[PDB]
Symmetry: C3
């Protein structure tokens, strides 16, 4: 690239080149189902319900398996005393009655209910276990489709340290970020067992290989006003540059990222010398053509950078009587937020968003006989005390 | 396009053209963790378990942080009465015993257990909170990979009204449907804090710009029988048409939808006049070639519309002795469900599905001492009543 | 293909060809919400909370709806006895007191609390129902975006038998595996009702049609050393071969899989005879060009199969003083794990992973007055027994 802004060529982002062609198939099955058991037969119903739910959610995937006056009176009063004793017997009866209720269900059954409540807590733990299942595979558990594998499944092998994971194997920041943002890893379920509860999935560990000085720029063709006509140069929108000798870039089967391009194989091939000469400054070798369509854009846009050309189109931003433009020699002019509030290139309205960010969303808020006994004891103590002394010493031998 | 059915050109679907080149990066962090606290120290264990689960599910993502005879007898009977009083004392003892149990654990501890049950309900609410977390980001929470952002996260900013959201910013139905069905939005996690519990993600609000009269038709080349040979015209499968002057369409880096095509940038370029002349009716300028491969299809298929050519191939649908065809001039003939039950164009079996729809799936179904006391009181009342009057008036001064 | 290894052409994987062009739109709505009701008004709060959660998670999606000295003494002692009777009355009072507590909340309210615990279990079941919802659609429930539909939703129509599902409709293993690993099915939500709780989604049942003998090989161009220069033949990286007459392959709008390529329509077209002649052995017709870029690879890589060319580059694996190479006639040489421990072709380090598989991850582990009554009864029985006989027979007529 040189000082050739007059032909409408504009550089863009630089993308690194990486190669992934090393597979690995050494999968081994490791059990991960949490152990559940009953010690007091309280969680048996909960265990059965959990097993039924696990069976229901876990499809048998058989398709994959197949494919791959006084004298009498003192007597009568005594009888009355006996009647009082009979009344005491009746009280003894009530002593059993409430006790029978205590013997019926009050003590044991309620206590058993308490264990059920503990089982309920276990059920809550089961729900947490379900979350641990959900974070285990996520979408991969739903279907055996190649998709992003959860980081928690790949990590936490021995000490959950990501630094050790990235240091044990030679890797850089760029390829790791590309993998973590694109999802080049692939996952497929092998077999699912309802009873033993083990799920095996194909773990993918790509080993990206980089190429030194594998820089490539993006070119946006822009028509230029030469003489009276408007000429446009036929140049590919993506060409690799390297000192003097370079080659073209084919994106028919390549995936691009924020700052790199990922391709399964290599596609380098020799390119014609005419294009190299035209890019080097020889405008005569460039294939110029007259524009015959109004749909050809006169301005380029790259990640919010607008090269507005006000020589032919309009660049009104806030008013309609300001014919701001540039010199005849200059073709592309930068139009950023430092020139006007809301710039509108051409006759098409374009601007940025007004509000953007994480909206406020709150889930919920958590909010919030002693005297009688003493009197009875005193009466009992005093009565015998004043009756025994009175009766014993009054009559004797 | 004109009346040129003899050369095998067939129009298809029309796709609108839109441009997205305006980014926006003004992300701000807003807390969304539901407040949880304990008032009676009952949910402390539940709170600790929830915090541990949150820490376990939320990876520290340190990689992203680093990168970016008577006289004696009446005495003895009295002693017996005292013995009965002693028996009453024994009853008093039992009065404490059961009461001691009431004082031990019956009243307080069970009540405390009740609070635990309330905590269990809180735990259930926690599970609901987990669902509110799951709907918050979904897959985006699992990994920082560019994917579809949940509508509930973007919406519900102030009043959950989608109409206000679509009216505040200028948008149409087509681009909104394309975004909602394709997932052009991108999402990346910035930072995750275990303690404060805030998660920040890159919110994407694309601003699609439309182009008036940006219609483009799809062309399917079909060989035609001229003289004895079968000639096929070399025409691109996707070319834009606009009155008279038009241009070609390049789909090497463009994504197509049901009724539109989305491209990051513009790709308009002048096209040769020979192709325009050939498309306009000048069959001489068309590049005709003799077919030298049996794999070339003699019929076209577009969204269930079959242009079966029975002149050369066969069009048996229900029998094998019906040579139904068309005139020599006509090349493509429509073959819909109104002509035969199950049409089979050529020697390849093709038909529609037999059963399609939402299958029936049901989760589960929810299914479902008074007399003794009165007698004791009456006996107590009558005994004293008939003993006091008898004793008092019988003996005196 | 013939014995033409000297020109650098290497065969690769074979991909089958399939056509999908038969849509189907006969969607019908079927209710799937589990029935919930209250029999004892215990789950009313739980039902309200579940309904509120369902309303919150289920967006109204209005955008889609709009778009589409003695004498006195014996008296006094009797009064004392009456006092004892009064004490008994006091005991009767306590008989009510505890009973009042039993009548207050001990029996009924606690029992009501028990029903609440049952409701808590129902709440746990509700969480399980949520899981049944999560497995119902998964990501499709989150947004109406075309993605993989869960197998459990498509299956379980009548007897959950996958064999019957694959036998009722004519299908093979290859296309079924391609669908299950790529996700060609599309899904879109039609309408969502909060009250009736029915969700309708577009079910996709592709009917892939195969083409006999639709085999195609992959060709990787490799430069060859002829005379002093290094010549590379210009040959497309993907060309179909069939006996003698064949045609080119265009992948501009085709998706490739592990062992097949899926395209929406057909793209067969005649190819020039010069390329066929060059591929058949006529090296004169081949378009050879001198390499003018060092980025051109001298070795090919295909699924871990490396054709290392040590004639020009280096093939050091374990040492740096071993110039192992091949004969001048041979250009490509296989370099597998049976030749060296860690092979490094050229000056770029490349190898396989060290550790790969499912890591160990454990969620959690589940761990674990009779004597007094008899004495009172004996005292009561003996006292009356020895007092009645003594009193009755001592005094009489």
């Amino acid at each position: 690239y040189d000082s050739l802004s007059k032909v409408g060529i504009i550089k863009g982002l630089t993308y690194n080149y990486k190669i992934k062609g090393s597979p690995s198939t050494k999968l081994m099955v490791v059990k991960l189902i949490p152990n559940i058991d009953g010690v007091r037969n309280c969680t048996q119903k909960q265990f059965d319900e959990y097993k039924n739910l696990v069976k229901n959610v876990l499809e048998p995937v058989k398709l994959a398996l197949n494919a791959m006056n006084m004298k009498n009176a003192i007597q009568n009063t005594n009888e009355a005393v006996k009647q009082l004793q009979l009344a005491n017997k009746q009280t003894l009866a009530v002593i059993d009655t409430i006790r029978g209720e205590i013997n019926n269900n009050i003590i044991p059954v309620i206590n058993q209910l308490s264990c059920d409540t503990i089982g309920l807590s276990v059920g809550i733990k089961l729900t947490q276990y379900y979350s641990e299942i959900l974070t285990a595979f996520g979408p991969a558990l739903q279907n055996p489709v190649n998709t992003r594998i959860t980081i928690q499944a790949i990590s936490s092998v021995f000490n959950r340290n990501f630094d050790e994971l990235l240091k044990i194997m030679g890797y850089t920041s760029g390829d790791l970020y590309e993998i973590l943002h694109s999802g080049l890893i692939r996952g497929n379920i092998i077999d699912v067992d309802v009873e033993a509860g083990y799920i095996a999935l194909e773990i993918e560990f790509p080993n990206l290989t980089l190429v030194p000085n594998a820089v490539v720029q993006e070119l946006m063709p822009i028509s230029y006003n030469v003489d009276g006509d408007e000429w446009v140069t036929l140049v590919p929108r993506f060409v690799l540059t390297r000192t003097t000798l370079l080659s073209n870039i084919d994106t028919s089967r390549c995936t691009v990222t924020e700052s790199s391009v990922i391709c399964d194989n290599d596609y380098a091939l020799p390119m014609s010398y005419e294009l190299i000469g035209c890019l080097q400054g020889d405008t005569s070798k460039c294939a110029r053509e007259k524009v015959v369509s109004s749909y050809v854009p006169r301005f380029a846009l790259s990640d919010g950078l607008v090269y507005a050309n006000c020589l032919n189109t309009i660049c009104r931003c806030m008013d309609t009587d300001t014919p701001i433009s540039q010199s005849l020699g200059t073709t592309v002019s930068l139009l950023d937020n430092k020139k006007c509030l809301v710039y509108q290139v051409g006759d098409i309205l374009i601007s940025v968003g007004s509000y953007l960010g994480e909206g406020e969303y709150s889930a919920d808020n958590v909010e919030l006989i002693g005297n009688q006994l003493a009197g009875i004891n005193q009466t009992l103590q005093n009565a015998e005390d004043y009756i025994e002394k009175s009766e014993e010493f009054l009559k004797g031998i």
